[PDB]
Structure formats: structure tokens, C-alpha cells
């Protein structure tokens, strides 16, 4: 009953958060076994960020250049290397709190929990979605770099995001845990800006299904639509085009409710053209688009971890 | 930059979550040191919940009537007692993960994080505010009872809420960690229903200040108001009357943004009279009241 955008319990990730200092720059690092992963621009300052030479700046740094702190424990760095936009520090202590984990690259529209840290000290946790324009609308202040986003299934923490920078509009850009940025962005001070963005249609449909599962179903109708005709309407409202693959992904929710996806599209189409008329869906006056088909099954079907 | 309904990191609470069973009934419990706290209605069944006498129900139970488990492992109960609407079950082991903590009773209008659990295992975390009417608008499924709400300041966890029940409107009710219910609710199946509710004026203002801190000020205007004249308007919109105390709380944000509280009130006044006009504030098409002034200061730029 009731509908919240829930984060994953952050405990398994809190246990991996450390503070990384290099010179006067301090940000967050991710400690798994005997490796600390952090944004490579921890070795940077000012005009360094103005078109930096990373290979080169790193070369003048040695192991004792990086101070690493887990709580009060100082971790001795015994190795460093660069991996794409990531720095990999080898430490002499394997993290006793390392969860079962993996590194996955997330697809646009998909969601994850973010653990905002400052000085290696976790400060908050929230859900967000990887925007179609390859940014995240997060909440980050100075010193938040190195904070990570993640998903859980069973006992396995899947890390998908590490925070690197803030774009001109106040949205955020970052990398997977191999150091490859999401979107065009680069870790320098340039003119780079967020592209225009769209509403995540797949997620809106997922959420509409969640409403129906909760008994909130006034918006359904007796009609259906072709994919092509849905996309013509939807795109006029700045919705991501719905693909046959998105339709297949809504299969389980579709089967579970006995409402065919295109039947739900007809309902959405009507909602966009005529609005909601003062009524609400799942308590909202607005159509939510940060809730995936998987978040719906997770939240509605009491899953735990673990 | 950005603005999220941020919960506290939940790991210090996760480490305290256990399962408590009695008869056929299972729910969550909070394991701190050598004591496990859970809702007393775990000892109730069928027509027990129609009109339970808890003293009479409990006296029929022994220590071994209670099965407590941390994950897959059983903790032996070696004592039991009732504190208002909670059971306190002493166990033979101490919980090494027990964080620095305290129990606090929170005022309506304040916020906290909830860690929704089923079977003594963490499901998710979310932020919410206690309504003026003492209910919380939550996301709970059958089995979430015993789940707790908390705030973390420093390394010390302050527990303020334990979940007991769901009301007819689908809104939820529970107690502080001493068993005292928030609101006029009791742990029976009565016809009790959520009382009239109001929008949390103090929170709305703090949120407006957050918007200004974010470089947005389209909603501002050239007027001021008296406290008295603000209330005469806001109270027509189901808004919680605003006091001088509320105004003083807003001092830090006012000073920081250079906007006087009563001027910010005059802004909110106009927003109520004229509406938002399809325009958003911090990405919202409606006014948010689930961020206290303290939440804003904690999240937003200094």
C-alpha cells in the first residue's frame, strides 16, 4: 500500500566507501578487496581541468601521493594505475567488508540507487534513472565525486555508476566502473552540455502497470493502438519512441495484469492528450518516469536482500 | 546541484534487523545489544485482534514461545516484557553491529528514513515526513510490521518510529521506540481512521528557500505580509497555521538567501492565490512539504 521511490539498502555499499586525497583535492573512493577505484581527476587542479594530460600528471605522482582513509584507518597505497577515466589504487589491506559484487554498464532509462558521500563518509541515499540524454538528475555538492550508483539482486551488488562531474544545467555525468563515461562527456573543463532529453516511455508504462496492480485503474479503456500510431502521439509530447524490444520487456507485467502493452499505450495516449483531470495515479498528479519494469516487480512483490 | 528526497544511509539499521515469530505470526524486530524490540501484536491471532487483552495474552506465553532469528540463525530468548505497545525480548547474544543510538519521539511535520523489511530482511529505504495527523504516507506490504524509521546525525542513530499497522485510507500508523503510538491509534482492529490533515507550511517555505538557493526565483514578488495576514490566506488552503517559532527556524535560510521570511511568505501567499501556472519549482509541479528546514540545510549548498 502506498507508492514510494525506494532505494536499495545501502549497507553493503556504505562498507566500501573511503576518502581519497591527492595534494589539496579530496574525494571519494570505492574499496573492493585490495583495490580502491576513484575518479582519475583526483590528481587535478584548476587549469589542469582546463585540458589535462592524465598520462603525464599521473607520472609525477607516486604511491605516497594518494592518501586513502577508511574511517580512521589509513590504507597504505602500494600500487597505482589508470583505467580509462578511473584511478586504481592497490592497497595493502583487502576490504573485510567486500560484498559479492560485479561491474555492469547500465542502459539509458534504467535506474539505480546512489549513495552520496563526502570525505569518504556516506551522507544520503536516493534513487535516480539514467536519462535518455545520458545524464542523471542527482543531488551532488562539492566533494561528491567518487560516489557510486548500484543495483542489488540476491546477495550481489552490481555497481553501475561513479560520479565525476556537474554539467552547466546542474545535472550530472559519470562513468561505469571500468572508467568509460556515460554519454559524450569527458573529464575536462570544456563547453560540453546536456543534450535535450525525453520522458522514459518504457518506465511510464511500467508505472502505469504498477498503478493497475495496486487497484488504481481509472485510466484504462476498451481500445488499442498500433506501435506506429502510439509513437506519433507520444513523440509530440517528447516521449522516447517505444520499440518492439520495450514491448517485449513489459511482457511479464502485461501477462500479470492481462493488459496487452498496446492496450496500455492507448490508455497512455489518452492520458497525454486529455491529461488526468485533477485525478491522480498512485498518488501523483504527474506521470512518473523513473520507475522501471524491474523496480515495479521489486517494490510490488516484496523482494529482500539478503 | 539537484534536489532529491534523500534518505539516510541504512546500513547501521540493517545490522539490527531480525525476525520474530510467535505461533503462526512473523514480523520484524530491532536487535540492539541484548534486547529485541518488536510490536506486541505479534502474540495475537484471529479474534485476538478483534479485542486483545495483551496482559492476558502475554501471561500465557513463555520465553520459548518466541522464535527470534538473525538471518538463518536462531537467538535464544531468555526474558520477555511489555512496554506499552512493544515487546522487549532479552536474548542470550549481544549484537556486535549495534550502532551508537537513541530513542526519540518526533513531532508532526518532521522527517525520517524508513527501512522497509520483510521477514527480518531489508527490502528498501525511503524518506518521509510524519503528517500533522500523525500518519505517514508509506509503501508497505503485509509483513512490514516492526520496520523502523530513523535519522542519523553523526554516527549516532536516532530511532523514532516502529511500524504497527495500515489504516483504511492506505496510510500507515506506528509508535516511538517506547511503544507510545503517534496519533489516536490502538493495536486492535477497530474502525479507527486517519484524522483531518494539513499541508506542512514550515516545510513548504524551506523548500521555496531551497529553490532560491538553486538559483531559481521566478515565484518571488515585491510584497511582504504580516504573519497574521499570511495565515488568513494559507488557512483557507488547508495549510498548517504558521507561528513565530516557525519564522525563527527559517532564519538561517533567510539570512543565506537574503530573502526575509515574511517576504517569502508573501511569495507563498501569491502561489496559493494564483497557482503555479504550469511552471515548476525544483522540478515539481506542486508545492512540496516533505523537506524540513534542517533537511534543506543538510542537502543544499551552503
From Swiss-Prot, chain B:
List the catalytic activities from the record. Answer: TSAVLQ-|-SGFRK-NH2 and SGVTFQ-|-GKFKK the two peptides corresponding to the two self-cleavage sites of the SARS 3C-like proteinase are the two most reactive peptide substrates. The enzyme exhibits a strong preference for substrates containing Gln at P1 position and Leu at P2 position
- Role of this protein: Cleaves the C-terminus of replicase polyprotein at 11 sites. Recognizes substrates containing the core sequence [ILMVF]-Q-|-[SGACN]. Also able to bind an ADP-ribose-1''-phosphate (ADRP). May cleave host ATP6V1G1 thereby modifying host vacuoles intracellular pH.
Question: Under what name is this protein listed?
Answer: 3C-like proteinase nsp5
| Cytoplasmic topological segments | 1-302
Q: Which domain of life is it from?
A: Viruses
Q: Describe, as the record does, how this protein assembles with itself and its partners.
A: Exists as monomer and homodimer. Only the homodimer shows catalytic activity.
Which residues are in the Peptidase C30 domain? 1-302
- Tell me which residues this entry annotates as catalytic: 41 (for 3cl-pro activity), 145 (for 3cl-pro activity)
Species of the source = Severe acute respiratory syndrome coronavirus
Compartment list: Host cytoplasm; Host Golgi apparatus
Amino acid at each position: 500500500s502506498g507508492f514510494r521511490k525506494m532505494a536499495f539498502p545501502s549497507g553493503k555499499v556504505e562498507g566500501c566507501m573511503v576518502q581519497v586525497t591527492c595534494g589539496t583535492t579530496t574525494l571519494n573512493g570505492l574499496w573492493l578487496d585490495d583495490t580502491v577505484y576513484c575518479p582519475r581527476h583526483v590528481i587535478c587542479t584548476a587549469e589542469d581541468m582546463l585540458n589535462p594530460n592524465y598520462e603525464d600528471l599521473l607520472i609525477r605522482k607516486s604511491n605516497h601521493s594518494f592518501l586513502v582513509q577508511a574511517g580512521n584507518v589509513q590504507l597504505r597505497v602500494i600500487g597505482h594505475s589508470m583505467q580509462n577515466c578511473l584511478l586504481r589504487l592497490k592497497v595493502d589491506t583487502s576490504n573485510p567488508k567486500t560484498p559479492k559484487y560485479k561491474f555492469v554498464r547500465i542502459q539509458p532509462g534504467q535506474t539505480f540507487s546512489v549513495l552520496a558521500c563526502y570525505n569518504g563518509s556516506p551522507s544520503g541515499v536516493y534513487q535516480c534513472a539514467m536519462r535518455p540524454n545520458h545524464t542523471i538528475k542527482g543531488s551532488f555538492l562539492n566533494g561528491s565525486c567518487g560516489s557510486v550508483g548500484f543495483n542489488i539482486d540476491y546477495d550481489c551488488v552490481s555497481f553501475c555508476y561513479m560520479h565525476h562531474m556537474e554539467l552547466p544545467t546542474g545535472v550530472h555525468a559519470g562513468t561505469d566502473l571500468e572508467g568509460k563515461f556515460y554519454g559524450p562527456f569527458v573529464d575536462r573543463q570544456t563547453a560540453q552540455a546536456a543534450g535535450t532529453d525525453t520522458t522514459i516511455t518504457l518506465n511510464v508504462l511500467a508505472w502505469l502497470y504498477a498503478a493497475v496492480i495496486a487497484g488504481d485503474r481509472w485510466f484504462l479503456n476498451r481500445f488499442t493502438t498500433t506501435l506506429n500510431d502510439f509513437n506519433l502521439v507520444a513523440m509530440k509530447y517528447n516521449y522516447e519512441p517505444l520499440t518492439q524490444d520495450h514491448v517485449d520487456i513489459l511482457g511479464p507485467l502485461s501477462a500479470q495484469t492481462g493488459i496487452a502493452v498496446l492496450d496500455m499505450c492507448a490508455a497512455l495516449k489518452e492520458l497525454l492528450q486529455n491529461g488526468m483531470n485533477g485525478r491522480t495515479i498512485l498518488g501523483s498528479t504527474i506521470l512518473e518516469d523513473e520507475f522501471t519494469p524491474f523496480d515495479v516487480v521489486r517494490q510490488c512483490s516484496g523482494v529482500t536482500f539478503q
